[PDB]
Design an enzyme around this catalytic site. Structure first.
Site, PDB file in Angstrom:
ATOM      1  N   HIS A  44       0.811  -1.248   0.000  1.00 55.98           N
ATOM      2  CA  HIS A  44       0.000   0.000   0.000  1.00 55.98           C
ATOM      3  C   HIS A  44       0.844   1.298   0.000  1.00 55.98           C
ATOM      4  O   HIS A  44       0.357   2.354  -0.413  1.00 55.98           O
ATOM      5  CB  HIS A  44      -1.072   0.003   1.117  1.00 55.98           C
ATOM      6  N   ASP A  93      -0.636  -7.622   1.353  1.00 52.27           N
ATOM      7  CA  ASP A  93      -0.019  -6.311   1.555  1.00 52.27           C
ATOM      8  C   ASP A  93       1.463  -6.467   1.860  1.00 52.27           C
ATOM      9  O   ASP A  93       1.938  -6.341   3.004  1.00 52.27           O
ATOM     10  CB  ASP A  93      -0.790  -5.484   2.610  1.00 52.27           C
ATOM     11  N   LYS A 160     -13.601 -11.020  15.431  1.00 54.78           N
ATOM     12  CA  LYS A 160     -14.690 -10.455  16.263  1.00 54.78           C
ATOM     13  C   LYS A 160     -14.563  -8.941  16.342  1.00 54.78           C
ATOM     14  O   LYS A 160     -15.557  -8.244  16.504  1.00 54.78           O
ATOM     15  CB  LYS A 160     -14.632 -10.992  17.719  1.00 54.78           C
ATOM     16  N   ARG A 161     -13.325  -8.438  16.271  1.00 57.54           N
ATOM     17  CA  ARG A 161     -13.035  -7.014  16.393  1.00 57.54           C
ATOM     18  C   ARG A 161     -13.223  -6.276  15.095  1.00 57.54           C
ATOM     19  O   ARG A 161     -13.266  -5.054  15.093  1.00 57.54           O
ATOM     20  CB  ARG A 161     -11.605  -6.798  16.946  1.00 57.54           C
ATOM     21  N   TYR A 162     -13.334  -7.015  13.990  1.00 61.55           N
ATOM     22  CA  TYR A 162     -13.460  -6.439  12.664  1.00 61.55           C
ATOM     23  C   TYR A 162     -14.664  -6.986  11.903  1.00 61.55           C
ATOM     24  O   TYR A 162     -14.530  -7.578  10.841  1.00 61.55           O
ATOM     25  CB  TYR A 162     -12.121  -6.550  11.897  1.00 61.55           C
ATOM     26  N   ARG A 163     -15.853  -6.775  12.467  1.00 62.44           N
ATOM     27  CA  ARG A 163     -17.110  -7.159  11.837  1.00 62.44           C
ATOM     28  C   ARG A 163     -17.215  -6.405  10.500  1.00 62.44           C
ATOM     29  O   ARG A 163     -16.900  -5.211  10.431  1.00 62.44           O
ATOM     30  CB  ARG A 163     -18.291  -6.792  12.757  1.00 62.44           C
ATOM     31  N   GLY A 186       1.975   6.400   9.539  1.00 59.74           N
ATOM     32  CA  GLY A 186       3.409   6.523   9.248  1.00 59.74           C
ATOM     33  C   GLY A 186       4.227   5.332   9.705  1.00 59.74           C
ATOM     34  O   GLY A 186       5.412   5.209   9.362  1.00 59.74           O
ATOM     35  N   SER A 188       3.193   2.158   8.969  1.00 65.41           N
ATOM     36  CA  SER A 188       2.937   1.105   7.974  1.00 65.41           C
ATOM     37  C   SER A 188       4.168   0.708   7.161  1.00 65.41           C
ATOM     38  O   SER A 188       5.044   1.537   6.913  1.00 65.41           O
ATOM     39  CB  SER A 188       1.732   1.431   7.097  1.00 65.41           C
ATOM     40  N   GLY A 189       4.275  -0.587   6.863  1.00 63.07           N
ATOM     41  CA  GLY A 189       5.420  -1.109   6.125  1.00 63.07           C
ATOM     42  C   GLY A 189       6.534  -1.565   7.051  1.00 63.07           C
ATOM     43  O   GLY A 189       7.395  -2.366   6.659  1.00 63.07           O
TER      44      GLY A 189
HETATM   45  N1  LIG Z   1      -3.473   1.216  14.135  1.00 65.18           N
HETATM   46  C1  LIG Z   1      -2.984   0.448  13.021  1.00 65.18           C
HETATM   47  C2  LIG Z   1      -2.212   1.347  12.033  1.00 65.18           C
HETATM   48  C3  LIG Z   1      -1.586   0.501  10.891  1.00 65.18           C
HETATM   49  C4  LIG Z   1      -0.811   1.389   9.900  1.00 65.18           C
HETATM   50  C5  LIG Z   1      -1.612   2.598   9.393  1.00 65.18           C
HETATM   51  C6  LIG Z   1      -0.736   3.451   8.513  1.00 65.18           C
HETATM   52  O1  LIG Z   1       0.353   3.897   8.893  1.00 65.18           O
HETATM   53  N2  LIG Z   1      -1.241   3.639   7.253  1.00 65.18           N
HETATM   54  C7  LIG Z   1      -0.499   4.396   6.269  1.00 65.18           C
HETATM   55  C8  LIG Z   1      -1.052   4.160   4.833  1.00 65.18           C
HETATM   56  C9  LIG Z   1      -0.295   5.002   3.818  1.00 65.18           C
HETATM   57  C10 LIG Z   1      -0.872   6.174   3.303  1.00 65.18           C
HETATM   58  C11 LIG Z   1      -0.147   6.987   2.420  1.00 65.18           C
HETATM   59  C12 LIG Z   1       1.168   6.626   2.062  1.00 65.18           C
HETATM   60  C13 LIG Z   1       1.743   5.467   2.591  1.00 65.18           C
HETATM   61  C14 LIG Z   1       1.030   4.676   3.493  1.00 65.18           C
HETATM   62  C15 LIG Z   1      -0.438   5.881   6.590  1.00 65.18           C
HETATM   63  N3  LIG Z   1       0.734   6.564   6.510  1.00 65.18           N
HETATM   64  C16 LIG Z   1       0.457   7.873   6.753  1.00 65.18           C
HETATM   65  C17 LIG Z   1       1.485   8.874   6.708  1.00 65.18           C
HETATM   66  C18 LIG Z   1       2.664   8.618   5.981  1.00 65.18           C
HETATM   67  C19 LIG Z   1       3.661   9.601   5.842  1.00 65.18           C
HETATM   68  C20 LIG Z   1       3.434  10.865   6.438  1.00 65.18           C
HETATM   69  C21 LIG Z   1       4.129  12.103   6.522  1.00 65.18           C
HETATM   70  N4  LIG Z   1       5.342  12.303   5.943  1.00 65.18           N
HETATM   71  N5  LIG Z   1       3.443  13.024   7.198  1.00 65.18           N
HETATM   72  N6  LIG Z   1       2.324  12.386   7.592  1.00 65.18           N
HETATM   73  C22 LIG Z   1       2.253  11.087   7.162  1.00 65.18           C
HETATM   74  C23 LIG Z   1       1.268  10.107   7.349  1.00 65.18           C
HETATM   75  C24 LIG Z   1      -0.923   7.943   6.835  1.00 65.18           C
HETATM   76 CL1  LIG Z   1      -1.948   9.311   7.090  1.00 65.18          CL
HETATM   77  N7  LIG Z   1      -1.457   6.690   6.757  1.00 65.18           N
HETATM   78  C25 LIG Z   1      -2.303   3.399  10.523  1.00 65.18           C
HETATM   79  C26 LIG Z   1      -3.107   2.470  11.459  1.00 65.18           C
END
Ligand SMILES: NC[C@H]1CC[C@H](C(=O)N[C@@H](Cc2ccccc2)c2nc(-c3ccc4c(N)[nH]nc4c3)c(Cl)[nH]2)CC1
Length: 238
Positions: A44, A93, A160-163, A186, A188-189
């Site tokens: 992603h 993913d 159960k947590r993700y209906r 931020g 993620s990955g």
């Molecule tokens: N509780 C479980 C967790 C599991 C992981 C999840 C997450 O991290 N999803 C990713 C998805 C994504 C979206 C866009 C680009 C790459 C990945 C994300 N990354 C940023 C993010 C990234 C860099 C940033 C920056 N340079 N400033 N702000 C920033 C914010 C945003 Cl918003 N969402 C959050 C919930």
């Protein structure tokens, strides 16, 4: 990371910060060193990334402030996204970054072992999630790499947590029933690293979740053990 603490330098030496250069340079995702030219991360992260030319991998970083224009990094030769991937919530993913040059291993940067096929039955009780992600829903990327110890949750409990979602066995969840500690925007990955028999194993890839550290909403991760054949297929190609 919500509810975590600052990591010590050299604590998670497989952790990388993947930066994008387009439009401006900033942290995009976490990743893990798994081989001398290989980063394992989430598919992603590449939404709208048209070329690997805009990517920079920085290893051996504790603080984002260590990164300036003169800081060395690894260029990305190739982005390998699992071909069944559609979106984080549906699984697959996982992506590999083939680096343009070889990572020299040392006390600041080295690989994390992938889980063993036989170890699909092992019970991990010492798991940590790391990253430079938000500490709260509305925040900014953190300077210092954070860490949080999180318990693994069964697939049945996570479902159960993700209906309304389908939590597959290619996903693995981790979280406290009352929340408080979790991956956040931020992170993620990045890795979900678990210690077993004094060896750290890459158990998960931070993927998705409903919000951050909410009660009864564990973080959902790519279940790495279910992709060991796919990783070897891509990294050990003849
Ligand atoms: N509780 C479980 C967790 C599991 C992981 C999840 C997450 O991290 N999803 C990713 C998805 C994504 C979206 C866009 C680009 C790459 C990945 C994300 N990354 C940023 C993010 C990234 C860099 C940033 C920056 N340079 N400033 N702000 C920033 C914010 C945003 Cl918003 N969402 C959050 C919930």
């Amino acid at each position: 990371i919500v509810g975590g603490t600052a990591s010590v330098r050299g604590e998670w030496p497989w952790q990388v910060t993947l930066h994008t250069t387009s439009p401006t340079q900033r942290h995009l995702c976490g990743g893990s060193i798994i081989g001398n030219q290989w980063i394992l991360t989430a598919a992603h992260c590449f939404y709208g990334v048209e070329s690997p030319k805009i990517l920079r991998v920085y290893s051996g970083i504790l603080n984002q402030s260590e990164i300036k224009e003169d800081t060395s990094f690894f260029g990305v030769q190739e982005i390998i996204i699992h071909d069944q991937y559609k979106m984080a919530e549906s699984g697959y993913d996982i992506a590999l970054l083939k680096l343009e040059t070889t990572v020299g291993y040392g006390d600041s940067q080295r690989p994390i072992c992938l889980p063993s096929k036989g170890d699909r039955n092992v019970i991990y009780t010492d798991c940590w999630v790391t990253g430079w992600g938000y500490r709260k829903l509305r925040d900014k990327i953190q300077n210092t790499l954070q860490k949080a110890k999180i318990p693994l949750v069964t697939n049945e409990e996570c479902q159960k947590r993700y209906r309304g979602h389908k939590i597959t066995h290619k996903m693995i969840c981790a979280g406290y029933r009352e929340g408080g500690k979790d991956a956040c925007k931020g992170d993620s990955g990045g890795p979900l690293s678990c210690k077993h028999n004094e060896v750290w194993h890459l158990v998960g890839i931070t993927s998705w979740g409903e919000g951050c550290a909410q009660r009864e909403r564990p973080g959902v991760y790519t279940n790495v053990v279910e992709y060991v054949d796919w990783i070897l297929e891509k990294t050990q190609a003849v």
